[PDB]
Amino acid sequence: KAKKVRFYRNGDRYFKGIVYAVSSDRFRSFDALLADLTRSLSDNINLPQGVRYIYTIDGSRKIGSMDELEEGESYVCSSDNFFKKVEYTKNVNPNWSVNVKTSANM
Amino acid sequence: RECISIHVGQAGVQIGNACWELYCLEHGIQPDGQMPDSFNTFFSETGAGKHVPRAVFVDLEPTVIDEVRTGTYRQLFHPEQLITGKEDAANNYARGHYTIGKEIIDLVLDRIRKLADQCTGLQGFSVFHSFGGGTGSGFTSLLMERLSVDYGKKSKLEFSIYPAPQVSTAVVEPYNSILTTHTTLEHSDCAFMVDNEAIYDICRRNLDIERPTYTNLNRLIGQIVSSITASLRFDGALNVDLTEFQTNLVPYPRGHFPLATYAPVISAEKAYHEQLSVAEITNACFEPANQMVKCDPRHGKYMACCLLYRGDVVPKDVNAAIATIKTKRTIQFVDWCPTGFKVGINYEPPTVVPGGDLAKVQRAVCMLSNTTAIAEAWARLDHKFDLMYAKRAFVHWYVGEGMEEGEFSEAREDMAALEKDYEEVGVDS
Amino acid sequence: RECISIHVGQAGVQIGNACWELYCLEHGIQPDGQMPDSFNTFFSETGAGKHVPRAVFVDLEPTVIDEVRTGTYRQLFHPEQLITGKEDAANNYARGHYTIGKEIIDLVLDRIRKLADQCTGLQGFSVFHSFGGGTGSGFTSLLMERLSVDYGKKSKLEFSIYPAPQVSTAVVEPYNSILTTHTTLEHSDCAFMVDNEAIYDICRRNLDIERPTYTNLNRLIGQIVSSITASLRFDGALNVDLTEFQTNLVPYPRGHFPLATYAPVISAEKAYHEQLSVAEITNACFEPANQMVKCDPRHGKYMACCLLYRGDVVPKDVNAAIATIKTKRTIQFVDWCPTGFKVGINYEPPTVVPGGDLAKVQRAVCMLSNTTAIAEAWARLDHKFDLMYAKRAFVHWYVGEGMEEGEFSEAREDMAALEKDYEEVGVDS
Amino acid sequence: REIVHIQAGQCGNQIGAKFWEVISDEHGIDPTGSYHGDSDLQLERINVYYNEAAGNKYVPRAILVDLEPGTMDSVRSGPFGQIFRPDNFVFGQSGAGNNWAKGHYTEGAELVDSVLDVVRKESESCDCLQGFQLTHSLGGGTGSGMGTLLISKIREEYPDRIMNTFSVVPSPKVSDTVVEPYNATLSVHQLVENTDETYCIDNEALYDICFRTLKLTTPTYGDLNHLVSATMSGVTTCLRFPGQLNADLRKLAVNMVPFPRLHFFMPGFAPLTSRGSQQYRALTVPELTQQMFDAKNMMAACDPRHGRYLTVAAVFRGRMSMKEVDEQMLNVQNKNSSYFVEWIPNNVKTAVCDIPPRGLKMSATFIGNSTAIQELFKRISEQFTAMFRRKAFLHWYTGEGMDEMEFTEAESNMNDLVSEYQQYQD
Amino acid sequence: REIVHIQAGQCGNQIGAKFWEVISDEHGIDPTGSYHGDSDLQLERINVYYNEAAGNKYVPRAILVDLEPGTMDSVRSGPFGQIFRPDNFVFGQSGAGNNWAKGHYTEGAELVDSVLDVVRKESESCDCLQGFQLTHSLGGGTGSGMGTLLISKIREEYPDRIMNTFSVVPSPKVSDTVVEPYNATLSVHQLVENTDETYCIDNEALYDICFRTLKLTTPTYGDLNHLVSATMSGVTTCLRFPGQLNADLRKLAVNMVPFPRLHFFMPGFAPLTSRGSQQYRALTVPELTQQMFDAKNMMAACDPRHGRYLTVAAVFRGRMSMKEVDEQMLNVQNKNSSYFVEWIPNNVKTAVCDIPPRGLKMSATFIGNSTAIQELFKRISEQFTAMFRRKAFLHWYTGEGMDEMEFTEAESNMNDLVSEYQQYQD
Ligand SMILES: Nc1nc2c(ncn2[C@@H]2O[C@H](COP(=O)(O)OP(=O)(O)OP(=O)(O)O)[C@@H](O)[C@H]2O)c(=O)[nH]1
Ligand SMILES: Nc1nc2c(ncn2[C@@H]2O[C@H](COP(=O)(O)OP(=O)(O)OP(=O)(O)O)[C@@H](O)[C@H]2O)c(=O)[nH]1
Ligand SMILES: Nc1nc2c(ncn2[C@@H]2O[C@H](COP(=O)(O)OP(=O)(O)O)[C@@H](O)[C@H]2O)c(=O)[nH]1
Ligand SMILES: Nc1nc2c(ncn2[C@@H]2O[C@H](COP(=O)(O)OP(=O)(O)O)[C@@H](O)[C@H]2O)c(=O)[nH]1
């Protein structure tokens, strides 16, 4: 299959990111993913040119290959980017990937 | 001296508009309020040239109270006295009593405390509700509730329209009526009852018309009721105060529910036929096909009747027509009761709608009474309840409205001892 | 005998134009000044045809006083008596009191010394200002200031429109009102208070209209005020002089601030409904929803009320309607005060605008009083202040206008002992 | 009170045009015109569906959600099409692919926020909100997927206001699509767990009822739609009229849903007679109950006669005797004691408006909650498995970011939903 | 009271033409004509911007400063161009080089005295002076340099009268120049220390707000300018009109500046609806606050939602209820308690004129002092360093008699200015 990821914009602490799917059939490379990410995360406050690179959740290293994208992952969009680093995102549930939680019988 | 009235629930309001109509109609007060004490126990002389009503109107949907402020009579009440909760009605007790209905109550009360003050030594509040409704069952439940505490020192006669024996409407009806009974029981003085279906029979069998609009049943109760307050609070040869009722009418604290009955129900077009005798109408009163209640005296021993007469009636005629009855035996009265016949004589004959379908005689008998008969009516209505509760049916609709397995189960047990009560006070010697 | 009036601040001027309107309206003196002593305590019979006002108008922007000299009434005042400082208003105390406002004061005074001379044994100056403004807070502050010294031997009743509890306008408002209070406190005799917001409620709840133009609130105070001076300085069955007030109304030197209240507020269109009883209006006076002040008697014990009645009123009706009240207890009056009810009876009934929205009854009750209630209103307004001062907020706007950390901090401490004062004189026995 | 219609997908949209075509006339609102209302009563309660701006322009308060321009651009370029404020059009020029997954997870999920935005602008309109009307088809993308999302979001934003759902469940005999059971099973799933009143209509239950109960020989879609829209008008709008005994969405809800599933109903109109001839006027009343309660005449596919009822709501709207109404209902309840479930002494919920359908003398909408609809979700559920088993056109879903456990989920859920419903038929 | 506009540079100038294009009509002053004023109120306060000479010739009391003839010779050769008394044109036929240094130290410094000369002739006009309006762009010579000097001199001559500054801070996405951050950082520096009210506008915040909030497809400059000029009219001129609750530059200043920096605001107009259609009239009032307080619609680049506010001034101008005004403001202050700073119980400064924008029913200028503008000086300041580090086009400055410590100065200063502003966001 593809890979489910939660894409946040560096320096936002408000927007809970947007969830994207990534595979070899959808995007031939990171530049093609980044091209669609520029459209879906298109902004002019947190992202200078919309989306030029993807950084780890902590911003320690930027991804250059689709093979580094894992399922249920969290990534950051950058263009410099200078890092605050802005974490933020929190908080949200990991239910975007899957609902870990379920209902219970309360 | 007076008796305020709180018409609650669309129905209690439709019936209200009706009973309220018959009123001015026999008091020469056009819909404009103006006529060209006596009856002051139901109308305040705001000045002035007018006759502002002496009651209030409570519905959670505007629709029905709205129509009042469209059709002549629009001029009759004060823009204020017609309370509404734009919100939602909900054919469910809970919501109307607890959750929603609550919000309005204060305001509601305020009027029955603002209208209760303005007067001069009142006697009570004639309440008008429709047992099996949302705004009618629930709400009132706490309205009468909040009254029994704020004016325990008065009369609380609630005039109800309890559930048609087979022709009910709401799917839940019983839920709403086993709940308005248990909550009001420990608060009312005397609860009058008029069965919606058993009134149709009268419209089919004693007036002939398969075209009975709600607007008719209302004209009817609108009649029987006129015999209660209106004329009674009106001078006569044998006056009967409101207190009088509950005293001469309830043998026991249970807000006992007598039944309303009228004598002369005969259709216009018959209007010319030679009138009926004092004896006939009297006798018509002991016929289980003329009592605005599907509680046919299937066994229910009367235990007290308040024969309110109006029009040209000779006290001997009565103190004879009744004597004849007291000795028909097939009319078996309770044991512990020697004589249970409160003879109420008024002067002014009835007053029929100009051109509805009511005969228009020169004398009538609005006899009401407590009959061990309702042992039935309650039974048959209680059973209903169980069937559904037995499966919780529409229970989630109340729970989610601030109620609990308690209020139901514990209001069921309530009436249970109302099936035993109405059984013990009779059938035994 | 008379009582000059100084309407300060656009508002105090708008309200002024209003109160000034109601006047001639009930004295038959067209806007042309001409009518076809009694009321001489507010109007001087200048020339041999007219009735030049008996007050003055002070605003630092022309806009508002300008409009007076456009719209009929244009003819009413003397071109002179309407003072202006083409300069700048500034919604800041400092500037209006010190810096700018100063320049005009002399001139201002001159009129209240030129108009104060022309008369015959006066009684005082009814001042009209809007607590939280620039020209209204500041200026007056020193106007009343310069009066308390030039005529310490008179009455200084200032009629204020203190800060809406939640619906204020100016961003600084409190700065301007904690400052007009501390500077005027040691100079006024009795400060009447009418809350702008709490008057809206009356326009929503007791008159129905979500379209209340400032021009209305003005018609209202324009009413309550007419009950103070106008009619009172006017003969009657129980006259009440201005001095009378402060005497029967202030228990302590703090220029104590009673609250204004009116009884009959009912909308035209209701105009026909049967009128209200002497008892009802009396009772309406003890309802925290009809008092032109968001100081609901949340606990504030009254300590003196001046029930000014006007119209057809029987002294017994009062010396009974009040008796009933004195024994409602839930209306708890101060301890150290046996009886605190100054019954002021006038003859001539009120006089409603030809076609505004005021009912027009034949009797009213403009009751004003000192209530330990304002312990609140002041509190809630003081707190405001701190929050901002706590950060200096718009402080640089005053400092740069001839003020200092002193005047603020030292006027805060001022009111502090006004929160303790209004606390000690009550709540304790 | 109030409500805010929702035109999800093309169908749900196409129907919007018919639901509003009608309703307006049943409220005297011309294209952009105002209230020409033959009467004065068709106005005191309009609010339920419009908004005051100009003074002659009461604009329908609905939402038009769709990922295919051409559609809304056919509804907006025709008759009443120019009454909706453009703000209402929440389009998705994307590829409105016929995939539930393409309009619920990938394509629709984007256009959602720009919808909720408006669904809030309309909700926070004024007065008090009651619920939202939802039209769509469970056999496509913009319908089942994206519309089924619109609600899952709505029901998180106001778990107080109600949610009536008008679904065009996949007709049996012939499916107007191929994956149908895929787009369907997946949307019913979302329904059984968000909206709390669903009125399932079948394009072929209509044809029938429209070609034999209306000798109508060429029943165009416009018609079907028209007939449907006729029922949804009797339901809502209607009850927002006076009546000896009136109800409103809730009453309807609080009298019709014994158990929280949400349960789906099957609407039926009253006077359904062919034009000229048939105009028999046999509408005294026994004629309306005669109608409403027969098998044919149930917009649903299944036949009531094939399973008890839990609740019924004859929402009549035309001057009649609370006696000949309350009465009839009874015999009906006794002639068919067989199928009408017993643990409910009075299944029927008699409702009675006053003013009738503009040009008619007496009508009565029927909203049945029969256990018969078991035999439909069965159908759907079957079609699924028979094709799921081979993962038929599944790559169009997964390839759109879906899950092999997602389909499992829905079927089961909706499949269990069949189970339960039988728990009462017995 | 009074004021004397100042058209520094081309931009500030180009805009002059639009600010006066408007204002005049909002005061019935035809080219050289007089007061044709539809009313009589658009005259009792004009003085604020004109002077009495003839009796039909009320001449705008502004200054036109620029080192590029062609410009002022385009503004003076077009429409209203022939209303300014020639004395107003303080040109500098020199080489109006795009260097902050060329218009602040070398070329402009000469033309200054011949300006101050007039700025005094106009100040000593009559009555009482309030302050001066200043238009320009912080991305050029005659704008940032020479105009930033004009004020440093003005503020030494009358440290009493106020100084509103309308700056066209360098738009992000794409700059209309190359050294931009040089000419900018250097002018903001001068601003943070002389003018005491600055309204920063962004050519691209406008486009947006002009291409999506006005379906306007070809937003020429004239437009942008026009929109801006619309706000500066609501501010000043407006308040110099009557009102239930009127304010004036100072109130605006004394209610909006908690701390002496001078702080910069972000103006926002009210009715900003596309021509035909949109003319929804949803302008009861909640609609104006709806507008004004949203992200988009803030002429600034940054988005309020990205940082608390210190002060706000809804300067409305159209008959409304001091209740529905004073009220709305509140909910607004509570729905967004999050961003609105707390140490100010009532951030908002409600202002209320009476007469509205000539052809409109109800409007309301918004002047926000939000901490969000931190994220702009950051921007600017960044661009500097990234290029300062390499002294990029620095030779064009130094070679004009500048200092390597001058640039250091400004950046730091303006850079610290970013710091401080955060001291409140927290
Ligand atoms: N006699 C008489 N009975 C009525 C009338 N209107 C309704 N009823 C009966 O009263 C009951 C109906 O109550 P509803 O109208 O449903 O409800 P409500 O009590 O007004 O209050 P809600 O449920 O909250 O709307 C049924 O048993 C009806 O048969 C009327 O005008 N006259
Ligand atoms: N009742 C009433 N209140 C008013 C009226 N005009 C203003 N106010 C209130 O008084 C205060 C306004 O004062 P401003 O008009 O700002 O100022 P001012 O006191 O006239 O003096 P300046 O600040 O120098 O202009 C607010 O609290 C208003 O709500 C009016 O006509 N009637
Ligand atoms: N009654 C009815 N059904 C329709 C209409 N349009 C499409 N349908 C039905 O809807 C199903 C197809 O889904 P469709 O509406 O095209 O999906 P979408 O447009 O991708 O959301 C088929 O079962 C059709 O019979 C219509 O106008 N009326
Ligand atoms: N809104 C707006 N911006 C302008 C106008 N003219 C130039 N600008 C902006 O001003 C900057 C260029 O500075 P410029 O005005 O040429 O400087 P100067 O003429 O040398 O003082 C660019 O960011 C432009 O977008 C205009 O008429 N309106």
mmCIF file of C-alpha atoms in Angstrom, chain D residues 34-170:
data_model
loop_
_atom_site.group_PDB
_atom_site.id
_atom_site.type_symbol
_atom_site.label_atom_id
_atom_site.label_comp_id
_atom_site.label_asym_id
_atom_site.label_seq_id
_atom_site.Cartn_x
_atom_site.Cartn_y
_atom_site.Cartn_z
ATOM 1 C CA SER D 34 -40.502 36.801 -2.313
ATOM 2 C CA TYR D 35 -43.670 35.563 -0.702
ATOM 3 C CA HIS D 36 -46.518 35.680 -3.248
ATOM 4 C CA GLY D 37 -48.264 33.240 -0.929
ATOM 5 C CA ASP D 38 -51.889 32.763 -1.857
ATOM 6 C CA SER D 39 -52.385 32.884 1.904
ATOM 7 C CA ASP D 40 -50.736 34.495 4.938
ATOM 8 C CA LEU D 41 -49.998 31.300 6.868
ATOM 9 C CA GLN D 42 -47.304 30.055 4.473
ATOM 10 C CA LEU D 43 -45.061 32.712 6.006
ATOM 11 C CA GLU D 44 -45.269 32.785 9.798
ATOM 12 C CA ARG D 45 -43.087 29.681 9.900
ATOM 13 C CA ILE D 46 -40.954 29.848 6.726
ATOM 14 C CA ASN D 47 -37.801 30.660 8.690
ATOM 15 C CA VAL D 48 -37.416 26.901 9.067
ATOM 16 C CA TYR D 49 -35.934 26.949 5.533
ATOM 17 C CA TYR D 50 -34.946 30.523 4.644
ATOM 18 C CA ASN D 51 -33.201 33.731 5.720
ATOM 19 C CA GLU D 52 -34.068 37.438 5.786
ATOM 20 C CA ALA D 53 -31.692 39.746 3.889
ATOM 21 C CA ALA D 54 -33.351 41.994 1.320
ATOM 22 C CA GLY D 55 -37.101 41.890 1.954
ATOM 23 C CA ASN D 56 -38.256 39.926 -1.072
ATOM 24 C CA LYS D 57 -35.330 37.537 -1.070
ATOM 25 C CA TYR D 58 -35.850 34.687 1.376
ATOM 26 C CA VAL D 59 -32.988 32.399 0.373
ATOM 27 C CA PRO D 60 -33.141 28.647 0.910
ATOM 28 C CA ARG D 61 -30.823 27.675 3.729
ATOM 29 C CA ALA D 62 -29.358 24.495 2.279
ATOM 30 C CA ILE D 63 -25.921 23.303 1.254
ATOM 31 C CA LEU D 64 -24.888 22.078 -2.196
ATOM 32 C CA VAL D 65 -21.979 19.681 -1.872
ATOM 33 C CA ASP D 66 -20.522 18.012 -4.975
ATOM 34 C CA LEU D 67 -17.173 17.192 -6.622
ATOM 35 C CA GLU D 68 -18.598 17.394 -10.151
ATOM 36 C CA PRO D 69 -19.079 20.933 -11.417
ATOM 37 C CA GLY D 70 -21.434 20.196 -14.346
ATOM 38 C CA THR D 71 -24.080 19.026 -11.865
ATOM 39 C CA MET D 72 -24.492 22.048 -9.596
ATOM 40 C CA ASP D 73 -23.881 23.998 -12.815
ATOM 41 C CA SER D 74 -27.079 22.462 -14.206
ATOM 42 C CA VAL D 75 -29.047 23.076 -11.043
ATOM 43 C CA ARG D 76 -27.710 26.613 -10.891
ATOM 44 C CA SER D 77 -28.261 27.240 -14.618
ATOM 45 C CA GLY D 78 -31.888 26.134 -14.838
ATOM 46 C CA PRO D 79 -35.199 27.106 -13.138
ATOM 47 C CA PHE D 80 -35.102 27.947 -9.414
ATOM 48 C CA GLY D 81 -31.348 27.516 -9.703
ATOM 49 C CA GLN D 82 -30.776 31.234 -9.138
ATOM 50 C CA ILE D 83 -32.186 31.482 -5.598
ATOM 51 C CA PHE D 84 -29.329 29.861 -3.702
ATOM 52 C CA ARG D 85 -26.747 32.376 -2.508
ATOM 53 C CA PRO D 86 -23.493 31.365 -4.301
ATOM 54 C CA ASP D 87 -21.954 30.931 -0.871
ATOM 55 C CA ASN D 88 -24.106 27.766 -0.677
ATOM 56 C CA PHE D 89 -22.304 26.065 -3.562
ATOM 57 C CA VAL D 90 -19.487 24.033 -2.023
ATOM 58 C CA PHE D 91 -18.080 22.474 -5.175
ATOM 59 C CA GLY D 92 -15.041 20.273 -5.669
ATOM 60 C CA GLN D 93 -13.877 20.672 -9.266
ATOM 61 C CA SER D 94 -11.661 17.644 -8.574
ATOM 62 C CA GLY D 95 -12.430 14.310 -10.219
ATOM 63 C CA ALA D 96 -15.746 13.392 -8.578
ATOM 64 C CA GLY D 97 -14.821 9.722 -9.047
ATOM 65 C CA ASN D 98 -17.561 7.219 -8.293
ATOM 66 C CA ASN D 99 -15.615 5.972 -5.307
ATOM 67 C CA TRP D 100 -16.940 6.174 -1.745
ATOM 68 C CA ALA D 101 -13.321 6.328 -0.760
ATOM 69 C CA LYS D 102 -12.620 9.109 -3.218
ATOM 70 C CA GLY D 103 -15.248 11.370 -1.706
ATOM 71 C CA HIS D 104 -14.806 10.431 1.930
ATOM 72 C CA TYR D 105 -11.050 10.111 2.486
ATOM 73 C CA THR D 106 -9.112 11.601 -0.353
ATOM 74 C CA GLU D 107 -10.996 14.066 -2.438
ATOM 75 C CA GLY D 108 -13.959 14.956 -0.254
ATOM 76 C CA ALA D 109 -11.962 15.197 2.951
ATOM 77 C CA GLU D 110 -10.418 18.371 1.586
ATOM 78 C CA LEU D 111 -13.614 20.092 0.501
ATOM 79 C CA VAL D 112 -15.131 19.263 3.899
ATOM 80 C CA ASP D 113 -13.675 22.116 5.959
ATOM 81 C CA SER D 114 -14.894 24.580 3.312
ATOM 82 C CA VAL D 115 -18.326 23.034 3.851
ATOM 83 C CA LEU D 116 -18.502 22.804 7.638
ATOM 84 C CA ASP D 117 -17.543 26.463 7.430
ATOM 85 C CA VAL D 118 -20.850 27.261 5.800
ATOM 86 C CA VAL D 119 -22.913 24.637 7.653
ATOM 87 C CA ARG D 120 -21.919 26.808 10.648
ATOM 88 C CA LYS D 121 -22.644 30.102 8.940
ATOM 89 C CA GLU D 122 -26.156 28.751 8.352
ATOM 90 C CA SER D 123 -26.584 27.102 11.743
ATOM 91 C CA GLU D 124 -25.531 30.249 13.583
ATOM 92 C CA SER D 125 -28.026 32.067 11.370
ATOM 93 C CA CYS D 126 -30.609 32.913 13.994
ATOM 94 C CA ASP D 127 -33.291 31.765 16.431
ATOM 95 C CA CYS D 128 -33.037 28.095 17.409
ATOM 96 C CA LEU D 129 -31.833 25.250 15.206
ATOM 97 C CA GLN D 130 -33.791 21.993 15.105
ATOM 98 C CA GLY D 131 -31.796 19.786 12.710
ATOM 99 C CA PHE D 132 -30.525 19.307 9.147
ATOM 100 C CA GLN D 133 -32.096 17.628 6.116
ATOM 101 C CA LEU D 134 -29.765 15.430 4.082
ATOM 102 C CA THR D 135 -30.361 14.218 0.536
ATOM 103 C CA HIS D 136 -28.082 11.891 -1.392
ATOM 104 C CA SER D 137 -27.643 8.465 -2.924
ATOM 105 C CA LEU D 138 -25.750 5.624 -1.325
ATOM 106 C CA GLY D 139 -24.461 4.536 -4.704
ATOM 107 C CA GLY D 140 -21.661 6.943 -5.598
ATOM 108 C CA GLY D 141 -18.812 9.145 -4.420
ATOM 109 C CA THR D 142 -20.101 12.625 -3.652
ATOM 110 C CA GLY D 143 -23.187 10.966 -2.269
ATOM 111 C CA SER D 144 -22.383 8.127 0.081
ATOM 112 C CA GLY D 145 -18.805 9.036 0.880
ATOM 113 C CA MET D 146 -18.599 12.813 1.055
ATOM 114 C CA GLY D 147 -22.165 13.271 2.276
ATOM 115 C CA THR D 148 -21.738 10.549 4.838
ATOM 116 C CA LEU D 149 -18.764 12.517 6.068
ATOM 117 C CA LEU D 150 -20.612 15.801 6.151
ATOM 118 C CA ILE D 151 -22.856 14.267 8.748
ATOM 119 C CA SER D 152 -20.214 12.503 10.828
ATOM 120 C CA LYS D 153 -18.881 16.046 11.277
ATOM 121 C CA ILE D 154 -22.270 17.677 11.746
ATOM 122 C CA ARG D 155 -23.089 15.125 14.517
ATOM 123 C CA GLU D 156 -19.933 16.118 16.377
ATOM 124 C CA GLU D 157 -20.731 19.785 16.127
ATOM 125 C CA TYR D 158 -24.300 19.634 17.395
ATOM 126 C CA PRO D 159 -25.135 16.219 18.903
ATOM 127 C CA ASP D 160 -28.257 18.073 20.033
ATOM 128 C CA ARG D 161 -29.948 19.145 16.819
ATOM 129 C CA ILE D 162 -31.521 16.282 14.837
ATOM 130 C CA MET D 163 -30.472 14.672 11.553
ATOM 131 C CA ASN D 164 -33.004 13.436 9.041
ATOM 132 C CA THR D 165 -31.457 11.559 6.191
ATOM 133 C CA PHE D 166 -33.086 10.979 2.828
ATOM 134 C CA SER D 167 -31.162 8.134 1.203
ATOM 135 C CA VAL D 168 -31.715 6.633 -2.209
ATOM 136 C CA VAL D 169 -30.736 3.110 -1.232
ATOM 137 C CA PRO D 170 -29.561 1.036 -4.268
#
